[PDB]
Structure 1
Amino acid sequence: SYDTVMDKYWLSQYVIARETYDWYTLQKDYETVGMLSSPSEGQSYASQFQGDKALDKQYGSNVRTSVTIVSIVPNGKGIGTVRFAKTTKRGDGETTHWIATIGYQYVNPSLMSESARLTNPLGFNVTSYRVDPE
């Protein structure tokens, strides 16, 4: 269905933004994840760029981790599975495989601003995020 393609699109945008580490894309991705998730998930995600051992502090412009969406399975019940590959470099770097289990819902778009709808037109909102090894 039409809805299924649309879910895969948002699930993909979400994973790519959350799983990517790139100094020059950092604030935009951090902001994408922020607008795309509930407060509870937002803080949880934010925790890694918080404190002193923050990733940006550690890595800076030296490390880069690119994401490759391999497959996405929406389940039509608010849960989505996303298989993807992570590639980290400072050579070919190290490529690792993972599965993100995502809890998501669409929140009434008419309750946001028009400008906010320019980035999240359908009110896509992530309620829970889980990443596991293969």
Structure 2
Amino acid sequence: YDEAITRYFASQYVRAREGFQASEAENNFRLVSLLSSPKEQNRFGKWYAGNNPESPQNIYHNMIATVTIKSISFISKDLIQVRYYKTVRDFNEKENISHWISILNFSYVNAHISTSDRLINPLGFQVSEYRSDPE
């Protein structure tokens, strides 16, 4: 497929995985899950679990964390680098900005997707490996 559409989905994936807002948690969780390989769905879920203090649910509890994409680059046929910053805002007036870099192992799979799951993952974008580190 096009590079623009792959960038489109890599951006989305990183925003949904690394951002957080209570109102959008169920949608973001489901978006990330649908764009993840079964093995990756599982790591993501253990990480997002409410009992993990490093879950976005917890570290951004009562906060809003927005991801701004800086750049997206292909290191390889199936390897994307996404540089971004998180802007985090509390119940008060206080912004902390921090910079991060994510690596996605990805591909597209012709599989079965229900008519409605295709309104989220129309092309079978699948992230098989993922990592986020600060800069």
Q: What TM-score, normalized by structure 1, do the two folds share?
A: 0.87
Aligned to 1:114: 115
**Whole-Å Cα distance in 1 between the matches of residues 59 and 131 of structure 2?**
23
Aligned to 2:124: 123
Aligned to 2:84: 84
Q: What TM-score, normalized by structure 2, do the two folds share?
A: 0.87
Question: Residues 97, 116 of structure 1: CA spacing in aligned structure 2 closer, same or farther, 3 A cutoff?
Answer: same
**Whole-Å Cα distance in 2 between the matches of residues 126 and 58 of structure 1?**
24
Question: Residues 101, 114 of structure 1: CA spacing in aligned structure 2 closer, same or farther, 3 A cutoff?
Answer: same
Question: Residues 53, 131 of structure 1: CA spacing in aligned structure 2 closer, same or farther, 3 A cutoff?
Answer: closer
Q: CA deviation at 1:39?
A: 1.5
Equivalent AA in structure 2 for residue 35 of structure 1: L
Question: Residues 12, 59 of structure 1: CA spacing in aligned structure 2 closer, same or farther, 3 A cutoff?
Answer: closer
Q: CA deviation at 1:47?
A: 1.5
Gaps of 5+ in 2: none
Cα deviation digits, residues 45-73 of structure 1 (max 9, x gap) = 1123325345435654x122110001101
Question: Residues 76, 122 of structure 1: CA spacing in aligned structure 2 closer, same or farther, 3 A cutoff?
Answer: farther
Aligned to 2:107: 105
**Whole-Å Cα distance in 2 between the matches of residues 125 and 28 of structure 1?**
17
What percentage of aligned pairs have identical amino acids?
A: 38
Question: Residues 57, 132 of structure 1: CA spacing in aligned structure 2 closer, same or farther, 3 A cutoff?
Answer: closer
Instruction: Name the SS for the 1:108 alignment partner.
Output: coil
Question: Residues 97, 117 of structure 1: CA spacing in aligned structure 2 closer, same or farther, 3 A cutoff?
Answer: same
Aligned residues: 131
Say what the alpha-carbon RMSD is for the aligned residues. Answer: 1.9
Q: CA deviation at 1:6?
A: 1.1
Q: CA deviation at 1:75?
A: 3.9
